[PDB]
Amino acid sequence: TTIAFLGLGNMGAPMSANLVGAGHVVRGFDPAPTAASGAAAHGVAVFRSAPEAVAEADVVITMLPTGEVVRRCYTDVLAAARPATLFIDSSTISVTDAREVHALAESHGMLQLDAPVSGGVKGAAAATLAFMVGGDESTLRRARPVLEPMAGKIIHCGAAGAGQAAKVCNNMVLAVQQIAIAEAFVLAEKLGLSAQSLFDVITGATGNCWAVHTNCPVPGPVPTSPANNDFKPGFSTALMNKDLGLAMDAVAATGATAPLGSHAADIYAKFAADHADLDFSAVIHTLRA
Amino acid sequence: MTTIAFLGLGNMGAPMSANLVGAGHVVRGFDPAPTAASGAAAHGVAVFRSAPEAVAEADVVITMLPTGEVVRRCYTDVLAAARPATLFIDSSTISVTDAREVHALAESHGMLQLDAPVSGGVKGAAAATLAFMVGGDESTLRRARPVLEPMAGKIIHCGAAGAGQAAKVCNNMVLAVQQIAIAEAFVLAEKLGLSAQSLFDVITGATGNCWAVHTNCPVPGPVPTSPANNDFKPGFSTALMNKDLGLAMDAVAATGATAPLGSHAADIYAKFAADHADLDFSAVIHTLR
Ligand SMILES: NC(=O)c1ccc[n+]([C@@H]2O[C@H](COP(=O)([O-])OP(=O)(O)OC[C@H]3O[C@@H](n4cnc5c(N)ncnc54)[C@H](O)[C@@H]3O)[C@@H](O)[C@H]2O)c1
Ligand SMILES: C[C@@H](CCC(=O)O)C(=O)O
Ligand SMILES: C[C@@H](CCC(=O)O)C(=O)O
């Protein structure tokens, strides 16, 4: 399988290295020389333009920052692709942009999936990413052998756009929980209830969630959590702020009522103005702002 | 086998007291609602004419009462009647401030005292699977264990007087926020065209998982035992969640803490309780459609 990998940044570089490692021929493009060089260093044949990379590919993967850039990439390469090429967008973009690029690709006789990922740079390097997939079941089946060497988990969420919608709904919940857990720790501390006690109760009770059992925002109860390491990501406030922006786009596009999700989004946008580089659990310290 | 006075023989007290009788304790009951008292007598509680009489010959006094004010008043009524160094356990859910006040009052009368509020509701009470979250001295809890075990699935020592109440109220605030957030996610998914089943599968397999979805799923289908499938019959009523959120807001106000989402969830539940006090708190999903 020949794969064109368009977007060889912090996530795209290690993903493409895993594809090389699993015996694929990987062709690449990235407009940053340092990204492109690094990728070429791990066996990717790097081209000057995206249409060139796409020319001989059976699979085209995108990992790009915004739906506008994904859309532009598609209209730039689709005429250069061979018919029935499999396009997989693993960018995190709005559900609307997802469905539009899906329709665009299929109108050219291509097969297309949205497959955004959770797990970060660490997961990308370790080939444990979670792919949340929208599109036809039979297209996902064809894609499976390409996704497997990058992935710890592959979930079919529904029709085109469903992968984006699933990830955005999960991350909106996550942001709310990380804030709620932080509020609970600071309340407990003011009430004279130790962090370890609150942790022991909440993790054995209805309030338990990853935000506490793994990402506990106070040092001590979970020695590996970012709070014990100067809030080094982990999952950065910058990235969380990006997902919540998308969640607010989806809320605006649908007219949905999302009071706590929107409030979380407000909170994280403000926090990202100061602390974008810290793990999102660091929000515990911006509560008095 | 000791003698226990049980003051408050209502929805929670009646089944609690029945388990104490079944374990071989002599249980001396008082409740001024004759209906509650009658029901408790039927399961073997010896019912007295007055709270001071029930407590006069008890090693342990348990209160399971509606509010801090009622607990305070009850203590004021009975403490001088109890024998010196009688062990008072308050399993009512009351403010942390109220707990500390009643605790100090009990001790100024020469009584041992714990706060031991519970989770599990009436089904937990009947089955003797309640979780007791205990504040007070470790040695008093040691003295109390034989009495709490027949009623309990879990007994956890949370810290000094008031810490049981604190732990509960912190957990329940988180829970209220999670239940709204999950509701928001499911409604947003529906608007995006992502199925409830698929959102369920994703969130429960991802970082957003929590009891509010995996057990209390607010859409019918994915968890057939959740209230959504049984006309939102509680479960954990909106009336009770609204009470616990009032207590959290008392704690927030007493401490000067900042709890944006917890307070926003308090406002949401206070509004929903005006008309849907009788519905499971997962029914708040209704306000988002
Ligand atoms: N019901 C639940 O599902 C649940 C779950 C967890 C915790 N709780 C908490 O348990 C406590 C009791 O709940 P409940 O559902 O049994 O309430 P309830 O109203 O059914 O019972 C309270 C009982 O106390 C009696 N009472 C009032 N004043 C009294 C006095 N001075 N002496 C003796 N008895 C008196 C009332 O007459 C009543 O029968 C509350 O603080 C509640 O928040 C309830
Ligand atoms: C096992 C996994 C793909 C194989 C892998 O990359 O670990 C999956 O199918 O979810
Ligand atoms: C909660 C108690 C067990 C009593 C029971 O199983 O009912 C204990 O293990 O301490």
Swiss-Prot record, chain B:
As its record notes, the protein acts as a catalyst of: 3-hydroxy-2-methylpropanoate + NAD(+) = 2-methyl-3-oxopropanoate + NADH + H(+)
This protein's record includes keyword rRNA-binding: no
Q: Which GO terms describe its molecular function?
A: 3-hydroxyisobutyrate dehydrogenase activity; NAD binding; NADP binding; oxidoreductase activity, acting on the CH-OH group of donors, NAD or NADP as acceptor
Q: Which domain of life is it from?
A: Bacteria
Task: Output the Pfam families linked to this UniProt entry.
Answer: NAD_binding_11, NAD_binding_2
The biological process GO terms on file are:
valine catabolic process
Bilayer-crossing residues are none
Pathway info: Amino-acid degradation; L-valine degradation
**Keyword field:** Branched-chain amino acid catabolism, NAD, Oxidoreductase
Catalytic machinery residues: K168
* Family of this protein: Belongs to the HIBADH-related family.
Q: Which NCBIfam families match?
A: HIBADH
What protein name does the entry list? Probable 3-hydroxyisobutyrate dehydrogenase
Q: Which gene encodes it?
A: mmsB
